DNA sequence: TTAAGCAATTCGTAATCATGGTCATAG
DNA sequence: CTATGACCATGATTACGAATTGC
């Protein structure tokens, strides 16, 4: 639709090109000036024209060190080594490398690992034509022949072997999202005949190019475009959708320019005649194939940078492809930006200890962006429901009926139209409200990885990134040592506490940052690391090397600097700015998203720790990795030495305090006086003391005062914050307990949340006791909402699951007949009900999906819930504050509790009735026994207060639905099973016709007919 | 058969007749001719040779848990 | 060709081991 | 018609894997 502005008046022999570049590529090419791999850079000028960038003459290349022989130090064993091999038998050595410039070059360099010398040593420097024949010529030098003249005797091995990309952004100094100048006379815009379809396209050579590092006026954001979009298909009953027999109904796309505060396009295009919106274009096909082309044809004119959604890459773009490929539609799939290539998909998988396994699909568009905010959010954030509902709720605050919305007229069409556009409208605000893309180009300025890497991989290609860039200031080079297996080492120490509740306050001290710095001050790195022979025979000791508690020696600052000390101070010195950045906001929200920044750069900065010790990886060194542990525990037992030592009754101070907990970086004193500014000055005092028996940047420092404190295991406490005094308090803390946990019920955390509101801010442990009373009679009572009673488990690796049987394994492999094509796949999270049966054996055959015991009506165990969900936390939480008359106490609270209880041939009733004062069964309709006569106004009096309740329960949630919905005068239909509002929906319907006829027992209270 | 049933799912979804996804086919039929709206002579034509079928003398979700 | 670390607590299922109620037949 | 231990049946203890959180 809208296009992009003019390029007017650009003339290469006297002006320059200043833009913004978002993607790379590798391109195998001819039409050579008179190398074959040339360079892709697309990007953005400071107005908003499009730029392709031809770069020209790059090769990849290694090193391997030149062998101690006559060869690799003559000229004619040199040339050799270029030269092949003419005999019969070197067909394996000299065909799949064959005739290629590697060529021969002589070079002084150093190895990385270990401290051998300031001396250097010669190695050779072998370039290669293409980057796909690194791998043959690796298998063809090291276990190939190299049995050439004698000038190379195997092996010698090769040393950084990194990939093309990475290699010429580390070569230059341009790192992701950058400012790229192309000077004058430098660059031919005609010289390229138009092979993309950008405006203006350049053709220079890879050494014309100047970079400009963000900082200063170059610290800016070229104004981008974003496009969102969302589909709708046509299924049957039942049936999920399949890309063979489905029809593709309606396209709804957003588009802006970034940093305007509204969209500038808004355009649906729908399958039938529709009606008009007011705020968008509306386009009408009969058939789909216009539809598929249309939509092409608006992408290829409008352009975009970024392409944004939600569950896009797993749905909305294979769809379409498989559509276009069963209608015969031959033009559709060549989204991309190069003009003659069209995509396909393919299959990838990702797997860590950190964030699980996913298996992805992903779709070629080259040029193009993809962003997907579902991905997003799955990498950083954990939470209970990845539903586009639940997350909108979590945030901001919300098949077979849409198949007859789109059969019957226009202004059903027209709702539906409306609804596709508000659903392609929420990513663009999740996006810019939680300071997405910010954090992304912040991310790819710091590390010096492209834009494309921070969505497809994990931590490892950015700390080798900034190691490489780090290493060509003085001349060294890595190498290669791999291993299967290493054992592991010792871990972190955890302090014995003194478990209980506690009621004088506790203050906690603790030291920032504890690994980069023992890393930084202690001068710690692979090119510092002594070998246990090369100190001997020297004898200096001193000020020259030092020993760790596992062994090592390590050599002072005196005569070296570590590559690991600069990389963590430059990622510690950002995450500072971070924080002085965050200490001047007020909106909560954007409070949260600075530390969600801060948070980032600290992960960054403990994974360049954590990849030392990774014995599955590229470079491992866990003798660092030992002498960090145990510099950690030797400074955490002085600290405890320290802190209970000084401040003690014979040294003039009131109290000897006694430390009660200790957990790796903390401290958490208990000192004895209850008043809490007294606490706060000598906790104050304590942590600055402390702090002076280090080197630099070693500081401890105090955090909080707990009053009261309540300390249950290792990893579980409670406490309340302070951290004024006149600022009274903050919040609670709950580490670990069972209110932060997503095992569990909601019931269960509710009632550990409101137990501890009850029993740590009022101090009432008898409201606390009549709580969790009415909370348990209501359990058994039957008039607890089915979303208190939802669990939710995670669905790994089919193996482990495979190992032993659980229940959300057997609800997932369990298929339903209506649905043989919508089911959890690896990764995802299954929710399940347990319902009630007579299998003790087995809890993973009572176990059933939440609509489906909707639908279809199944009791539920309110003794499963009873004594395996809700009893053995109160018996944590209760027992430390009294004894084991506590624990009798509360299940005796259940026992006064405990004996009220609510109730194929469940069609061949009777229906008895019964007296409603007594519960005699007997013959005739009547409400009363005749026992149970002279009182029966206070009986009718009674239960009318219960009708008059439900009555106003009715009215407050079926106008609710009214609101939530937007309209007053049409249907509501919205069958959201994250909302509470359902099914809290359908059962007061139920609970009045119950109760309406309960009082028809009685006569009526008039005539009707006069 | 088969053309009956397009009629009725017709007339359930023109906007001009009520908002009906709580009550019979035929109370709405009535309740748009007592105010007169337009009820068209088909809609009753079919809702009179049948007897009680829940597929004719019933609103299209008259299932589904709203 | 691809992947940052260790410590600790909780819960469910199958298997191992203890103990009583019937029973079957020798006295 | 009546003792004795062999036989079936049901409940208490231990072991180990899976899941998830704290540094
Ligand atoms: C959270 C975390 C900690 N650690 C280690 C390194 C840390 O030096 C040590 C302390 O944990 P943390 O206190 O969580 O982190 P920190 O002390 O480095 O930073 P800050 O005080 O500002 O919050 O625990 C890891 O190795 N990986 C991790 O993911
Ligand atoms: S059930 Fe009602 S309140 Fe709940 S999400 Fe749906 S429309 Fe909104
Ligand atoms: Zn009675």
């Given at each position: 639709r809208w296009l992009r502005p003019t390029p007017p008046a650009l003339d290469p022999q006297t002006e320059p090109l200043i833009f913004q570049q978002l993607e790379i590529d590798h391109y195998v090419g001819p039409?050579?000036?008179?190398s074959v791999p040339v360079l892709r850079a697309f990007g953005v000028t400071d107005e908003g024209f499009s730029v392709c960038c031809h770069i020209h003459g790059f090769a990849p290349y290694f090193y391997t060190p030149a062998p101690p022989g006559f060869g690799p130090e003559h000229m004619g064993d040199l040339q050799r080594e270029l030269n092949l091999a003419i005999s019969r038998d070197s067909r394996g050595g000299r065909e799949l490398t064959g005739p290629a410039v590697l060529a021969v070059e002589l070079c002084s360099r150093e190895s990385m690992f270990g401290y051998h010398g300031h001396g250097p040593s010669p190695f050779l420097r072998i370039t290669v034509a293409l980057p796909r024949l690194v791998a043959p010529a690796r298998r063809l030098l090291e276990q190939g022949i190299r049995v050439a003249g004698l000038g190379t005797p195997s092996f010698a091995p090769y040393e950084a072997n990194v990939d093309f990309e990475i290699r010429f952004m580390v070569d230059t100094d341009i790192v992701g999202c950058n400012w790229l100048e192309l000077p004058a006379g430098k660059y031919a815009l005609r010289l390229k005949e138009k092979a993309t379809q950008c405006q203006l396209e350049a053709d220079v050579l890879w050494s014309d190019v100047v970079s400009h590092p963000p900082?200063?006026?170059?610290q800016r954001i070229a104004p981008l475009r974003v496009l969102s979009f969302d589909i709708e298909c046509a299924g049957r009953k039942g049936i999920f959708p399949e890309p063979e027999r489905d029809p593709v109904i309606q396209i709804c796309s957003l588009g802006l320019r970034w940093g305007e505060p509204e969209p500038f396009l808004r355009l649906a295009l729908t399958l039938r005649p529709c009606a008009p919106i007011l705020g968008a274009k509306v386009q009408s096909y009969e058939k789909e194939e216009d539809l598929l082309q249309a939509w092409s044809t608006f992408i290829r004119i409008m352009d975009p940078d970024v392409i944004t959604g939600y569950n896009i890459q797993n749905f909305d773009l294979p769809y379409l492809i498989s559509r276009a490929q069963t209608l015969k539609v031959?033009?559709?799939?060549?989204?991309?930006?190069?003009?003659g290539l069209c995509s396909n998909i393919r299959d990838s998988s990702f797997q860590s200890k950190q964030t699980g396994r996913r298996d992805t699909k992903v779709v070629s568009m080259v040029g193009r962006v993809q962003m997907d905010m579902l991905q997003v959010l799955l990498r950083e954030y954990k939470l209970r429901s990845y539903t586009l509902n639940a997350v909108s709720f979590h945030f901001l605050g919300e098949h077979s009926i849409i198949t007859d919305l789109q059969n019957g007229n226009d202004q059903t069409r027209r709702r539906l139209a409306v609804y596709c556009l508000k659903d392609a409208y929420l990513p663009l605000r999740l996006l810019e409200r939680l300071m997405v893309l910010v954090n992304a180009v912040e991310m790819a300025r710091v590390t010096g990885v492209p834009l494309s890497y921070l969505l497809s991989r994990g931590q490892q290609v950015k700390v080798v990134s900034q190691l490489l860039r780090q290493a060509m200031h003085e001349g060294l080079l890595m190498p290669v040592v791999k291993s299967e297996g290493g054992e592991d080492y010792t871990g972190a120490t955890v302090i014995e506490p003194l478990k209980g509740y506690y009621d004088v306050p506790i203050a906690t001290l603790d030291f920032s940052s504890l690994y980069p710095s023992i890393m930084m001050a202690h001068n710690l790195c692979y090119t510092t690391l002594?070998?246990?022979?090369?100190?001997?025979?020297?004898?200096?000791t001193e000020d020259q090397f030092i020993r760790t508690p596992t062994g090592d020696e390590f050599v002072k600052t005196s005569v070296r600097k570590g590559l690991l000390p600069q990389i963590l101070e430059n990622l510690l010195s950002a995450r500072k700015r971070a924080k002085a950045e965050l200490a001047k906001e007020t909106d909560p929200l954007r409070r949260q998203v600075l530390d969600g920044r801060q948070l980032a750069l600290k992960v960054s900065a403990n994974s360049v720790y954590g990849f030392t010790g990774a014995q599955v990886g590229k470079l491992p060194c866990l003798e660092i990795s030992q002498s960090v542990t145990g510099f950690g525990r030797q400074m955490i037992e002085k600290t405890k030495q320290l802190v209970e030592s000084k401040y003690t009754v014979e040294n003039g101070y009131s109290t000897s305090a006694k430390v009660v907990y200790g957990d790796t970086d903390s401290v958490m004193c208990r000192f004895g006086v209850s008043s809490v500014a007294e606490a706060m000055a000598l906790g104050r005092e304590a942590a600055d003391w402390v702090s002076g028996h280090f080197p630099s940047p070693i500081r401890l420092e105090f955090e909080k005062v707990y009053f009261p404190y309540l300390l249950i295991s290792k990893k579980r406490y409670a406490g309340l914050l302070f951290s004024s005094r006149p600022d009274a308090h903050d919040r609670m803390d709950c580490k670990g307990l069972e209110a932060v946990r997503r095992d569990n019920c909601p019931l269960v955390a509710n009632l550990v949340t409101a137990s501890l509101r009850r029993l740590l801010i009022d101090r009432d442990p008898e409201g606390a006791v009549a709580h969790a009373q009415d909370v348990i009679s209501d359990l058994l009572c039957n008039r607890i909402d089915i979303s208190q009673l939802v669990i939710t488990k995670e669905l790994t690796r089919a193996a482990s699951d495979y190992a032993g049987k659980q229940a959300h394994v057997e609800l997932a492999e369990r298929m339903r007949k209506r649905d043989p094509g919508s089911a959890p796949s690896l990764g995802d999270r299954v929710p399940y009900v347990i319902i009630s049966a007579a299998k003790g054996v087995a809890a993973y055959m009572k176990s059933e999906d939440p609509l489906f015991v909707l639908e279809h009506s199944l009791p539920i165990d309110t003794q499963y819930y009873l004594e395996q969900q809700l009893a053995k936390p109160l018996l944590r939480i209760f027992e430390p504050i009294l004894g084991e008359g506590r624990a009798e106490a509360v299940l005796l609270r259940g026992d006064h509790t405990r004996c009220k209880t609510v109730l194929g041939l469940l069609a061949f009733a009777k229906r008895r009735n019964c007296c409603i004062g007594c519960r005699t069964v007997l013959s005739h309709q009547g409400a009363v026994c005749e026992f149970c006569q002279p009182r029966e106004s206070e009986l009718y009096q009674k239960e009318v207060s219960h009708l008059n309740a439900l009555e106003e329960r009715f009215s407050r949630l079926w106008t609710q639905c009214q609101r939530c919905q937007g309209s007053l005068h049409e249907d509501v239909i919205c069958t959201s099973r994250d909302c509470p509002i359902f099914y809290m929906r359908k059962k007061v319907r139920k609970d009045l016709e119950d109760q309406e006829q309960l009082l028809r027992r009685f006569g009526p209270p008039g005539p009707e007919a006069w | 058969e088969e053309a009956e049933l397009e009629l009725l799912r017709q007339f359930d979804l023109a906007w001009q007749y009520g908002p009906c996804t709580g009550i019979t086919r035929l109370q709405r039929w009535c309740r748009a001719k007592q105010m007169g709206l337009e009820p068209p002579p088909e809609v009753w034509q079919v809702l009179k040779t049948h007897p009680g079928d829940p597929r004719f003398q019933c609103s299209l979700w008259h299932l589904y848990p709203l």
């Open positions: 039409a050579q000036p008179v900082e200063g006026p170059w031959q033009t559709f799939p060549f989204l991309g930006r190069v003009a002594l070998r246990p022979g090369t100190a001997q025979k020297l004898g200096l | -």
